[PDB]
């Protein structure tokens, strides 16, 4: 193996950083564009979100997949900044190189860094300080929808996805819980549907149906039986297997499965049900007794999904048929199955007017890339809308916020006696990389479209006027309503220094060439 | 991985949907030049294409941005009509002038937004030359026959073009809207007649009637049933174990014949003397049947037999155990006709109403496929006129004047998407210039003149060119509908774009 | 872009050259070939028509050669090797073109208008003699058998063939007669002179010994079941691991079957011919031998040709098993007839059966497989020669000599045409001059002066006459015993017409994945 | 296209660094001595900044820039020949990354003038004003200067000479400009620096003449530029010799001739004449001159072409190149005439008053050996250079290099809050700026980069405080340790240095 020190370990590393940047750069913001990749299975995958094209890629070197982490952990905490955090990290070592070059150590740097990025995060706390109550949230936080689900591509008839996801930070969560929601939250997307139509449920949706369509379409609130019992095949983990020989054997085993199939649905109905819900589904066989002893039930539950939809109903818990009581039996409201706009989406719905402690998020589209798109655009909207409902303090993206930061942090940079005064001044272009960026995806020049928003920022001191970001022709971000989450921005910022700061400590490489994944 | 970079993904979604492009434009429009299809890599033969269908699907693609084209223009034909020729050559005839551009160094947001606005001028146009033609039904009627006789020819069909003009504008007609396989079910089989097609009243099956089975049924009353037995019936008294030594495997061949008279017994009950099953048993399970006197018809067709169920009130649906069950369909005799030179066992009783039978006569299969995929293109169109029965004269002559309309908006209105609005404008124009040299006229000269005549208001004359003169739209009958063309038009336009929105292509 | 320039470029040349070498036709010219193949065998090849049916090629344009030999030899049977050297000219036409400037869409439309003007001048100058005459038809059919290797077996065979398409003809000059209706057997034993022309249907088969019906009275079979016997199709409980216990076995299921080969008479066999696909394995073979003792004739696993020819012109329909007795919708028949001559063949004759007013078939008789062969191809086209006449009559110059003489009258309508298409056809009217030309060129050396020559003696005849193609001299050309039937210089003409057009259409490179 | 002028461009650019670099190491009084080789093979020893460019420099367009830059300098200060290359180089090192960005040329041309009208706003604040009419207040700016130039060891001899020629040619408040065109550097064979004197008139080189007058008072001053004698033949003179009676010939001639032109210039009144070489007049008699000398006529003889273009000008005694000019307009008025042999060996003409247009003072340097007769030519020149420039400029600025730091860091904020397209062009400028300190402050030893952090956040909360300082290689004060120069010097190195660059970027 080779020993890469210094500048053999730096060089590398702009090397590295620089193929995953210039992708997300040109896939920044709702001027942002879509990038149509084909993998080596013959398919392709057509892609915009920065997350989903980390997952794609698996370019070269370690450094492409330390960034990969990072934009898994903020997807949860803030949602949307996946582009944005990537490429503002590939600024801070352009630069860095350009000061690498002149002679400066990379340690200087990485203090400097560090230090001029507390300079920007205290003028973003400025903008706005507010934490009002859940219902006066509602209408900014529509408007944040707005941009959000625009940075995935459309939005025109997307305020159905908006509107439900107030509803749905709402339920599962809490003002002032300080904690994450989005274990409790399901996505959910199935092909045929519209993205036109979005809705909200209450509880749970299972994929399967009624066993009959002559079973009664509506049961009762409460009184589910949760089941772990075959009425087909359970394919047991025994072993050696023996059939049935000639018409004797024949006749003897499916009249004894018959048999066994009626007094089961018998001690279900016994204990109170009108639901059963069953781990091993029914058979053609089992269809006969159901209906005979009259009762709903649905063909096959997943192994790990039947706690699922226990945790997410509050229902109380019975494991299997050898633990029938009358005292636990699951929450409804009603059990129907559901035809949202098509007959192409069935799914049952085992809705909740009592206790929901989950909610499940349907979104619908009539293709499979429509779905994916839709899905990602919807959970990400979620996450940001989340840091929202808990503090209303919000910010105007685009670009504007990164440009007024870039005034505050160059003139600080200086008035400290230390050589980190260098760095600092860089990490003011390179906070200026993201409304640049953005001009390359509105169809602008990179150069005068900063400098426009820059003069703007020299009078007020506050990001609520720039350039296009939803292109129309306004000089505006507030009568654009581009909006994303406070603690989003600032974490954008300080993640992207925290990381790079790991990378220009390191110039410690032990690889036999220059890259290894 | 594998990074292709920023200029480098571009300049293969343009060669690549260029190429394409270059098979589906010689048969688009007036008759021109034709594809024949070179194939040696699957296998080696020769195969004689006048569809887009055909051309682009059976050509892979291995360049990523040709793939997305060549699937969302095969669901327009289906849908649409005519999609597959339309939405291809306009998306390839966009990237080429996307790639002046780019050289130039127009961002790619300009070019697609240029485009896009020039699509809504475009479409704003197309409805300003399109007007009515369906105001009295009978004048619906022959609007419907020129819309016809424009998809039906350009695509090689011998004699069965001229039956299909009239053909597929009763049948859209008479329904009112939607499908139209529905109300007219393609039945295709050779016969003695070369290249002529019928309307059957009844439904007629291919397959000879031997045997003990009678070939002439009288007083039919048909149980339906979409399942069967595939030669051998298995049921509880039916399931034996009858084999495990070497003379043991007659015995269960033996067995198995014994297990066809069970399911003929099954029939029986029911007392209906006719029974569909939609898969074909052999010869000798045959004279079972036809001993006991319900007659199995196989190798039944679920086309044919819902053309009788709608007038007669059956139902279609499988089940049977007694006949109160599935409802009973009606015809009188069952009789061995034969046509062409192949005996057939050909239904009649009902005729008509809400679905006729089609039988096509040929003597290649070729020529049956073909057909069809021709006629299908036409019904779908013919479908979009029942709904808008305003059509717009084409042939080239549409194509040129939503271009006037955008270049003169291309000056006026925009701020820098200029270049791009005229850009759009140009890649129409590219149509009528490669058919004018396939004809025997002057590109340059055709689309630089009669561009401003039609625009001013002389939309009648428009593009003749399978002879490569001007000629009357009205009277010579080269006007489609105003639906086709306005979804092919969009769609080509959002194809194009997604392909040119790619700056870098990852490959993992 | 280039993807369609240099196709077109090469693929006629591709064509064109090896339509070079192939143009060496007629007579005795070039130098034979013995033949290395790509995977190693020694293969022996004379006579254009065979070879190009042959022909074993992968580049697609010159497929094309191969498939235009086999539609000429359906419609016309005549102008085999024909139809594609003129098709050659064609292509040659098709590049001076190209330079000239003048596109290929327009190349194609003149084409069609070559065609069109080209078959009325052959038309006119033809001279037209009756499709239901004898007279005329045996001089035409002597003109070709004398031309193939026969000169002594013609004397036997131009009178049968006037006979045979007699049989199944119709008044009209449309398209009648074919062979699907005239059904060619082979037999060996016999001899030339012995060849039997049965006005109704013969079929081609093997019959299992000698001692079988050769008499009059037959119902005719087309069965599709297999028996019910013990070990066969019926339950039998008798299970063998013993070569005692399979004796037993066989000996039941051969015994009731010698009972249901008199079922099988009762109806009326004497012909009985089973299914070419087995249910389990049809009839037993045990089962023929049986049926051979009720006088009833056999053949299991027998060829698609018979099939067809049953069901059509008999009516003669599938019936149902034997112990469930037989449906009676078999055809009619009266003879059953076990064909042996000078000790060998074995065949079925059925006379007397009911016909559609069509469908002949000729017996072809010789006592060595080689003398077969011999009288076979010459009778095939003395056939086609006469059947070419009642799809379309006439009789105009043969050998190809109209091709030359069609260019004279040709370049005169061209001129007059003055289109965009005139030159292009006037451009092929001077190729197919050069048909006895390239015939001759390739064979040995000083080519040049030969060349122009022929052209010259063909053209200074005029309208009416030229030199002959089958004897040399000036001499008229229109009847002289050089020539052949309209149908087949029409025919020549519109197949090359579309086959050549299509390499003109095609645009960019195309290859499926 | 424009592709072709930025490929240039970029060569030229790195071609032109490449030879600034070298000067970067040689800057100021701790610079690094460069061993230059000529193409004739001979090594050239040097630390002035100018004539490493001049005696060899490669053949690309922008190298050509720096020879003139400094050429100019030279006429302008005198003084900063090393340091305007310096930043000509670190613009160019700048412009590269406004190019990559897409700010145009024709941006950064202007907006580089623009930041130098910018730059001397701040520049001039800092500056303090000192007495141009007083003795003292020149010669201590003029000493500082001294101890950064190259020469040192007599010039604290020369510096109170240097004022006393400069403080004669100011007469009112203004203190003109003052320019080399009055001030003249004359050398003497013999002497020591303690002769040297400033004389009132010119002092002219050489002296020929020993049959003339040798001491004339109340002289008149007389200007030959006309010959002594006819035309040649083949010599200066009309004589020439092929034959005895040849020569008698042409005599008859010269004769007539000689007599005529010197009493012609007798009868107008001239004690001083100027008379120039015999390879710069066509002709002149020697026995013209024993006749001009005895009629007691103060005469020099041989003279420069350069000198009698400076005579004409300073004391007034305007050309006289004809018989028909010799008037009296044309003639000065001298006081003395006076050969001197004494402080320094041989004969030297001095006027010692003369009536004059400006003022005209020439310093007679002198010297033991005769390279210390060239090192304090070379000392003269430095420490009056300076002079010229604080009188032309009344304020006064620190040296050091902290002022250049001082101007970069109000640049780049003012340039921020103005904004535009040009922001980028005039905040790369200042942080070209900051190359210069930097550079020197490794040359007196001690981390550069870390050297030019600390003297900008010096600056920024105080101002007027840190610059690099001799003794301690350092960061210490230089308001401690007078470190001064005019203002003229700095305003002349960047104002020329930005033309350069604006130059170079608008050639193709």
């Given at each position: 193996?080779?020993?890469?020190?210094?500048?053999?370990?730096?060089?590398?590393?702009?090397?590295?950083?620089?193929?995953?940047?210039?992708?997300?750069?040109?896939?920044?913001?709702?001027?942002?564009?879509?990038?149509?990749?084909?993998?080596?299975?013959?398919?392709?995958?057509?892609?915009?979100?920065?997350?989903?094209?980390?997952?794609?890629?698996?370019?070269?070197?370690?450094?492409?997949?330390?960034?990969?982490?990072?934009?898994?952990?903020?997807?949860?905490?803030?949602?949307?900044?996946?582009?944005?955090?990537?490429?503002?990290?590939?600024?801070?070592?352009?630069?860095?190189?350009?000061?690498?070059?002149?002679?400066?150590?990379?340690?200087?740097?990485?203090?400097?860094?560090?230090?001029?990025?507390?300079?920007?995060?205290?003028?973003?706390?400025?903008?706005?300080?507010?934490?009002?109550?859940?219902?006066?949230?509602?209408?900014?936080?529509?408007?944040?929808?707005?941009?959000?689900?625009?940075?995935?591509?459309?939005?025109?008839?997307?305020?159905?996805?908006?509107?439900?996801?107030?509803?749905?930070?709402?339920?599962?969560?809490?003002?002032?819980?300080?904690?994450?929601?989005?274990?409790?939250?399901?996505?959910?997307?199935?092909?045929?549907?519209?993205?036109?139509?979005?809705?909200?449920?209450?509880?749970?949706?299972?994929?399967?149906?009624?066993?009959?369509?002559?079973?009664?379409?509506?049961?009762?609130?409460?009184?589910?039986?949760?089941?772990?019992?075959?009425?087909?095949?359970?394919?047991?983990?025994?072993?050696?297997?023996?059939?049935?020989?000639?018409?004797?054997?024949?006749?003897?085993?499916?009249?004894?499965?018959?048999?066994?199939?009626?007094?089961?649905?018998?001690?279900?109905?016994?204990?109170?049900?009108?639901?059963?819900?069953?781990?091993?589904?029914?058979?053609?066989?089992?269809?006969?007794?159901?209906?005979?002893?009259?009762?709903?039930?649905?063909?096959?539950?997943?192994?790990?999904?039947?706690?699922?939809?226990?945790?997410?109903?509050?229902?109380?818990?019975?494991?299997?048929?050898?633990?029938?009581?009358?005292?636990?039996?699951?929450?409804?409201?009603?059990?129907?199955?559901?035809?949202?706009?098509?007959?192409?989406?069935?799914?049952?719905?085992?809705?909740?007017?009592?206790?929901?402690?989950?909610?499940?998020?349907?979104?619908?589209?009539?293709?499979?890339?429509?779905?994916?798109?839709?899905?990602?655009?919807?959970?990400?909207?979620?996450?940001?809308?989340?840091?929202?409902?808990?503090?209303?303090?919000?910010?105007?993206?685009?670009?504007?916020?990164?440009?007024?930061?870039?005034?505050?942090?160059?003139?600080?940079?200086?008035?400290?006696?230390?050589?980190?005064?260098?760095?600092?001044?860089?990490?003011?272009?390179?906070?200026?990389?993201?409304?640049?960026?953005?001009?390359?995806?509105?169809?602008?020049?990179?150069?005068?479209?900063?400098?426009?928003?820059?003069?703007?920022?020299?009078?007020?001191?506050?990001?609520?006027?720039?350039?296009?970001?939803?292109?129309?022709?306004?000089?505006?971000?507030?009568?654009?309503?581009?909006?994303?989450?406070?603690?989003?921005?600032?974490?954008?910022?300080?993640?992207?220094?925290?990381?790079?700061?790991?990378?220009?400590?390191?110039?410690?490489?032990?690889?036999?060439?220059?890259?290894?994944? | 991985?594998?990074?292709?970079?920023?200029?480098?993904?571009?300049?293969?979604?343009?060669?690549?949907?260029?190429?394409?492009?270059?098979?589906?434009?010689?048969?688009?429009?007036?008759?021109?030049?034709?594809?024949?299809?070179?194939?040696?890599?699957?296998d080696a033969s020769?195969?004689?294409?006048?569809?887009?269908?055909?051309?682009?699907?059976?050509?892979?693609?291995?360049?990523?941005?040709?793939?997305?084209?060549?699937?969302?223009?095969?669901?327009?034909?289906?849908?649409?009509?005519?999609?597959?020729?339309?939405?291809?050559?306009?998306?390839?005839?966009?990237?080429?002038?996307?790639?002046?551009?780019?050289?130039?160094?127009?961002?790619?947001?300009?070019?697609?937004?240029?485009?896009?606005?020039?699509?809504?001028?475009?479409?704003?146009?197309?409805?300003?030359?399109?007007?009515?033609?369906?105001?009295?039904?009978?004048?619906?009627?022959?609007?419907?026959?020129?819309?016809?006789?424009?998809?039906?020819?350009?695509?090689?069909?011998?004699?069965?073009?001229?039956?299909?003009?009239?053909?597929?504008?009763?049948?859209?007609?008479?329904?009112?809207?939607?499908?139209?396989?529905?109300?007219?079910?393609?039945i295709k089989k050779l016969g003695g007649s070369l290249?002529?097609?019928?309307?059957?009243?009844?439904?007629l099956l291919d397959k000879k009637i031997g045997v003990n089975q009678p070939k002439r049924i009288?007083?039919?009353?048909?149980?339906?049933?979409?399942?069967g037995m595939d030669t051998d019936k298995?049921?509880?008294?039916?399931?034996?174990?009858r084999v495990?030594?070497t003379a043991k495997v007659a015995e269960i061949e033996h067995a198995e014949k014994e297990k066809m008279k069970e399911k003929v017994?099954?029939?029986?009950?029911?007392?209906?003397?006719?029974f569909i099953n939609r898969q074909l048993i052999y010869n000798y399970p045959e004279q079972l049947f036809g001993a006991a006197?319900?007659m199995a018809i196989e190798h039944a067709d679920?086309?044919g037999?819902?053309?009788?169920?709608?007038?007669?009130?059956?139902?279609?649906?499988?089940?049977?155990?007694?006949?109160?069950?599935?409802?009973?369909?009606?015809?009188?005799?069952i009789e061995e006709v034969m046509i062409g030179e192949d005996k057939l066992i050909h239904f009649?009783?009902?005729?008509?109403?809400?679905?006729?039978?089609?039988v096509l006569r040929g003597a290649t299969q070729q020529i049956l496929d073909?057909?069809?995929?021709?006629?299908?293109?036409?019904?779908?169109?013919?479908?979009?006129?029942?709904?808008?029965?305003?059509?717009?004269?084409?042939?080239?002559?549409?194509?040129?004047?939503?271009?006037?309309?955008?270049?003169?908006?291309?000056?006026?209105?925009?701020?820098?998407?200029?270049?791009?609005?005229?850009?759009?404008?140009?890649?129409?124009?590219?149509?009528?210039?490669?058919?004018?040299?396939?004809?025997?006229?002057?590109?340059?000269?055709?689309?630089?003149?009669?561009?401003?005549?039609?625009?001013?208001?002389?939309?009648?004359?428009?593009?003749?060119?399978?002879?490569?003169?001007?000629?009357?739209?009205?009277?010579?009958?080269?006007?489609?509908?105003?639906?086709?063309?306005?979804?092919?038009?969009?769609?080509?336009?959002?194809?194009?774009?997604?392909?040119?929105?790619?700056?870098?292509?990852?490959?993992? | 872009?280039?993807?369609?320039?240099?196709?077109?470029?090469?693929?006629?040349?591709?064509?064109?050259?090896?339509?070079?070498?192939?143009?060496?036709?007629?007579?005795?010219?070039?130098?034979?070939?013995?033949?290395?193949?790509?995977?190693?065998?020694?293969?022996?090849?004379?006579?254009?028509?065979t070879?190009?049916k042959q022909?074993q090629?992968?580049?697609?344009?010159?497929?094309?050669?191969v498939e235009?030999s086999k539609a000429?030899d359906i419609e016309?049977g005549?102008?085999?090797?024909?139809?594609?050297?003129?098709?050659?000219?064609?292509?040659?036409?098709?590049?001076?073109?190209?330079?000239?400037?003048?596109?290929?869409?327009?190349?194609?439309?003149?084409?069609?208008?070559?065609?069109?003007?080209?078959?009325?001048?052959?038309?006119?100058?033809?001279?037209?003699?009756?499709?239901?005459?004898?007279?005329?038809?045996?001089?035409?059919?002597?003109?070709?058998?004398?031309?193939?290797?026969?000169?002594?077996?013609?004397?036997?065979?131009?009178?049968?063939?006037?006979?045979a398409?007699?049989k199944v003809?119709?008044?009209?000059?449309?398209?009648s007669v074919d062979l699907r209706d005239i059904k060619i057997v082979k037999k060996l034993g016999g001899?030339?002179?012995?060849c039997e022309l049965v006005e109704g249907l013969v079929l081609t088969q093997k019959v299992s010994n000698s001692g079988i019906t050769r008499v009059e009275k037959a119902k005719i079979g087309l069965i599709q079941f297999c028996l019910s016997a013990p070990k066969t199709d019926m339950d039998n409980?008798?299970?063998?691991?013993?070569?005692?216990?399979?004796?037993?076995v066989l000996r039941e299921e051969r015994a009731y079957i010698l009972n249901l080969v008199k079922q099988i008479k009762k109806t009326g066999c004497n012909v009985l011919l089973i299914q070419k696909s087995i249910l389990r394995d049809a009839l037993s073979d045990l089962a023929l031998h049986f049926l051979n003792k009720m006088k009833i004739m056999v053949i299991k696993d027998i060829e698609r040709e018979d099939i067809e020819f049953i069901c059509k012109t008999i009516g003669t329909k599938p019936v149902a098993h034997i112990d469930q007795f037989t449906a009676d919708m078999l055809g009619s028949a009266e003879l059953a007839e076990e064909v042996n001559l000078?000790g060998s063949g074995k065949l079925l004759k059925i006379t007397g059966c009911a016909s559609p007013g069509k469908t002949v078939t000729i017996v072809v008789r010789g006592?060595?497989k080689?003398?077969i062969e011999?009288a076979e191809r010459?009778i095939h086209?003395?056939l086609c020669?006469?059947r070419?006449?009642?799809?379309?009559?006439?009789?105009?110059?043969?050998?190809?000599?109209?091709?030359?003489?069609?260019?004279?009258?040709?370049?005169?309508?061209?001129?007059?045409?003055?289109?965009?298409?005139?030159?292009?056809?006037?451009?092929?009217?001077?190729?197919?001059?050069?048909?006895?030309?390239?015939?001759?060129?390739?064979?040995?050396?000083?080519?040049?002066?030969?060349?122009?020559?022929?052209?010259?003696?063909?053209?200074?005849?005029?309208?009416?006459?030229?030199?002959?193609?089958?004897?040399?001299?000036?001499?008229?050309?229109?009847?002289?015993?050089?020539?052949?039937?309209?149908?087949?210089?029409?025919?020549?003409?519109?197949?090359?017409?579309?086959?050549?057009?299509?390499?003109?259409?095609?645009?960019?490179?195309?290859?499926?994945?």
């Amino acid at each position: 193996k080779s020993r890469l020190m210094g500048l053999e370990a730096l060089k590398s590393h702009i090397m590295a950083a620089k193929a995953v940047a210039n992708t997300m750069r040109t896939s920044l913001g709702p001027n942002g564009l879509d990038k149509m990749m084909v993998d080596k299975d013959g398919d392709v995958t057509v892609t915009n979100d920065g997350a989903t094209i980390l997952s794609m890629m698996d370019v070269d070197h370690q450094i492409a997949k330390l960034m990969v982490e990072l934009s898994k952990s903020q997807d949860d905490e803030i949602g949307d900044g996946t582009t944005g955090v990537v490429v503002l990290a590939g600024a801070l070592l352009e630069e860095a190189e350009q000061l690498l070059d002149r002679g400066i150590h990379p340690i200087r740097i990485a203090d400097g860094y560090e230090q001029a990025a507390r300079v920007a995060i205290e003028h973003l706390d400025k903008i706005s300080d507010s934490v009002l109550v859940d219902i006066k949230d509602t209408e900014p936080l529509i408007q944040t929808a707005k941009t959000t689900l625009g940075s995935k591509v459309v939005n025109s008839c997307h305020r159905q996805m908006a509107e439900i996801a107030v509803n749905a930070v709402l339920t599962v969560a809490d003002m002032e819980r300080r904690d994450v929601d989005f274990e409790l939250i399901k996505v959910e997307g199935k092909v045929g549907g519209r993205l036109e139509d979005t809705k909200l449920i209450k509880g749970v949706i299972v994929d399967k149906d009624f066993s009959h369509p002559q079973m009664p379409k509506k049961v009762e609130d409460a009184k589910i039986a949760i089941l772990t019992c075959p009425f087909e095949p359970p394919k047991p983990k025994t072993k050696h297997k023996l059939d049935v020989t000639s018409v004797e054997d024949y006749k003897a085993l499916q009249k004894y499965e018959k048999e066994k199939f009626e007094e089961m649905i018998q001690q279900i109905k016994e204990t109170g049900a009108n639901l059963a819900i069953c781990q091993w589904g029914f058979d053609d066989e089992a269809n006969h007794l159901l209906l005979q002893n009259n009762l709903p039930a649905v063909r096959w539950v997943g192994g790990p999904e039947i706690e699922l939809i226990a945790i997410a109903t509050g229902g109380r818990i019975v494991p299997r048929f050898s633990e029938l009581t009358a005292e636990k039996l699951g929450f409804a409201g009603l059990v129907q199955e559901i035809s949202f706009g098509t007959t192409k989406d069935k799914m049952l719905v085992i809705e909740q007017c009592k206790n929901s402690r989950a909610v499940t998020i349907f979104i619908r589209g009539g293709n499979k890339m429509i779905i994916e798109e839709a899905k990602r655009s919807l959970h990400d909207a979620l996450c940001v809308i989340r840091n929202l409902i808990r503090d209303n303090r919000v910010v105007y993206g685009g670009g504007a916020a990164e440009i007024s930061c870039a005034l505050a942090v160059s003139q600080e940079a200086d008035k400290c006696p230390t050589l980190e005064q260098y760095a600092m001044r860089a990490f003011a272009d390179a906070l200026e990389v993201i409304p640049m960026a953005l001009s390359e995806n509105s169809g602008m020049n990179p150069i005068q479209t900063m400098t426009e928003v820059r003069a703007r920022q020299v009078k007020e001191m506050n990001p609520a006027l720039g350039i296009d970001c939803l292109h129309k022709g306004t000089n505006d971000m507030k009568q654009q309503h581009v909006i994303e989450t406070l603690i989003g921005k600032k974490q954008q910022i300080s993640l992207a220094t925290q990381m790079v700061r790991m990378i220009l400590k390191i110039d410690d490489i032990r690889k036999p060439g220059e890259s290894e994944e | 991985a594998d990074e292709e970079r920023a200029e480098t993904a571009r300049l293969t979604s343009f060669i690549g949907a260029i190429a394409i492009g270059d098979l589906v434009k010689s048969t688009l429009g007036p008759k021109g030049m034709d594809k024949i299809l070179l194939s040696s890599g699957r296998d080696a033969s020769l195969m004689v294409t006048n569809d887009g269908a055909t051309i682009l699907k059976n050509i892979g693609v291995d360049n990523p941005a040709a793939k997305v084209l060549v699937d969302m223009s095969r669901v327009q034909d289906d849908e649409v009509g005519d999609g597959t020729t339309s939405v291809t050559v306009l998306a390839a005839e966009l990237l080429r002038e996307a790639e002046s551009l780019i050289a130039k160094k127009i961002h790619p947001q300009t070019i697609i937004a240029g485009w896009r606005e020039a699509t809504k001028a475009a479409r704003e146009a197309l409805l300003s030359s399109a007007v009515d033609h369906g105001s009295d039904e009978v004048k619906f009627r022959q609007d419907l026959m020129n819309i016809a006789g424009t998809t039906l020819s350009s695509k090689l069909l011998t004699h069965h073009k001229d039956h299909f003009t009239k053909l597929a504008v009763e049948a859209v007609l008479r329904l009112k809207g939607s499908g139209n396989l529905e109300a007219i079910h393609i039945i295709k089989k050779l016969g003695g007649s070369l290249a002529d097609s019928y309307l059957d009243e009844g439904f007629l099956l291919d397959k000879k009637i031997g045997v003990n089975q009678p070939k002439r049924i009288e007083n039919a009353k048909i149980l339906i049933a979409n399942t069967g037995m595939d030669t051998d019936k298995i049921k509880i008294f039916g399931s034996r174990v009858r084999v495990d030594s070497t003379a043991k495997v007659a015995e269960i061949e033996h067995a198995e014949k014994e297990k066809m008279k069970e399911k003929v017994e099954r029939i029986l009950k029911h007392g209906i003397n006719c029974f569909i099953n939609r898969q074909l048993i052999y010869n000798y399970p045959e004279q079972l049947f036809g001993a006991a006197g319900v007659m199995a018809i196989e190798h039944a067709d679920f086309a044919g037999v819902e053309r009788l169920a709608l007038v007669t009130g059956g139902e279609i649906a499988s089940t049977f155990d007694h006949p109160e069950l599935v409802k009973l369909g009606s015809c009188k005799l069952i009789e061995e006709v034969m046509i062409g030179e192949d005996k057939l066992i050909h239904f009649s009783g009902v005729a008509l109403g809400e679905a006729c039978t089609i039988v096509l006569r040929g003597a290649t299969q070729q020529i049956l496929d073909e057909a069809e995929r021709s006629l299908h293109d036409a019904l779908c169109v013919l479908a979009q006129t029942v709904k808008d029965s305003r059509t717009v004269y084409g042939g080239g002559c549409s194509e040129m004047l939503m271009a006037h309309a955008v270049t003169q908006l291309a000056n006026r209105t925009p701020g820098k998407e200029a270049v791009a609005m005229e850009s759009y404008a140009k890649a129409l124009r590219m149509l009528p210039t490669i058919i004018a040299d396939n004809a025997g006229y002057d590109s340059a000269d055709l689309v630089a003149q009669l561009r401003a005549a039609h625009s001013e208001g002389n939309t009648t004359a428009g593009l003749d060119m399978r002879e490569g003169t001007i000629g009357d739209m009205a009277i010579l009958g080269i006007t489609e509908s105003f639906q086709v063309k306005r979804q092919v038009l969009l769609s080509a336009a959002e194809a194009a774009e997604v392909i040119l929105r790619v700056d870098n292509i990852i490959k993992a | 872009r280039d993807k369609p320039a240099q196709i077109r470029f090469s693929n006629i040349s591709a064509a064109k050259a090896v339509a070079d070498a192939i143009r060496t036709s007629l007579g005795p010219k070039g130098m034979d070939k013995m033949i290395q193949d790509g995977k190693g065998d020694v293969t022996i090849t004379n006579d254009g028509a065979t070879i190009l049916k042959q022909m074993q090629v992968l580049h697609p344009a010159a497929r094309m050669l191969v498939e235009l030999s086999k539609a000429q030899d359906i419609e016309a049977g005549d102008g085999t090797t024909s139809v594609v050297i003129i098709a050659g000219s064609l292509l040659d036409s098709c590049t001076k073109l190209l330079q000239k400037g003048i596109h290929p869409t327009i190349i194609s439309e003149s084409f069609q208008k070559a065609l069109e003007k080209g078959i009325e001048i052959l038309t006119d100058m033809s001279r037209p003699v009756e499709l239901s005459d004898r007279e005329t038809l045996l001089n035409s059919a002597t003109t070709s058998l004398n031309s193939k290797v026969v000169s002594q077996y013609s004397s036997l065979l131009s009178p049968m063939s006037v006979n045979a398409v007699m049989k199944v003809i119709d008044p009209a000059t449309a398209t009648s007669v074919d062979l699907r209706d005239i059904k060619i057997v082979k037999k060996l034993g016999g001899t030339i002179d012995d060849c039997e022309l049965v006005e109704g249907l013969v079929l081609t088969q093997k019959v299992s010994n000698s001692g079988i019906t050769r008499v009059e009275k037959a119902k005719i079979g087309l069965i599709q079941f297999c028996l019910s016997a013990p070990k066969t199709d019926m339950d039998n409980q008798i299970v063998v691991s013993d070569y005692a216990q399979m004796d037993r076995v066989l000996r039941e299921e051969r015994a009731y079957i010698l009972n249901l080969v008199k079922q099988i008479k009762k109806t009326g066999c004497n012909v009985l011919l089973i299914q070419k696909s087995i249910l389990r394995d049809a009839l037993s073979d045990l089962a023929l031998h049986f049926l051979n003792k009720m006088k009833i004739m056999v053949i299991k696993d027998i060829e698609r040709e018979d099939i067809e020819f049953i069901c059509k012109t008999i009516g003669t329909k599938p019936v149902a098993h034997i112990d469930q007795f037989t449906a009676d919708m078999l055809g009619s028949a009266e003879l059953a007839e076990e064909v042996n001559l000078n000790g060998s063949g074995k065949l079925l004759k059925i006379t007397g059966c009911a016909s559609p007013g069509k469908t002949v078939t000729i017996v072809v008789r010789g006592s060595n497989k080689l003398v077969i062969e011999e009288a076979e191809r010459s009778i095939h086209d003395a056939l086609c020669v006469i059947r070419c006449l009642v799809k379309k009559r006439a009789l105009i110059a043969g050998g190809g000599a109209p091709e030359i003489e069609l260019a004279l009258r040709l370049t005169e309508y061209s001129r007059t045409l003055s289109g965009m298409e005139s030159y292009c056809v006037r451009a092929f009217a001077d190729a197919m001059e050069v048909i006895p030309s390239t015939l001759a060129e390739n064979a040995g050396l000083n080519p040049i002066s030969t060349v122009t020559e022929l052209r010259n003696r063909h053209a200074q005849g005029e309208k009416t006459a030229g030199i002959n193609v089958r004897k040399g001299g000036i001499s008229n050309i229109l009847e002289e015993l050089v020539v052949q039937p309209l149908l087949v210089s029409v025919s020549a003409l519109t197949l090359a017409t579309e086959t050549v057009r299509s390499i003109l259409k095609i645009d960019d490179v195309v290859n499926t994945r």
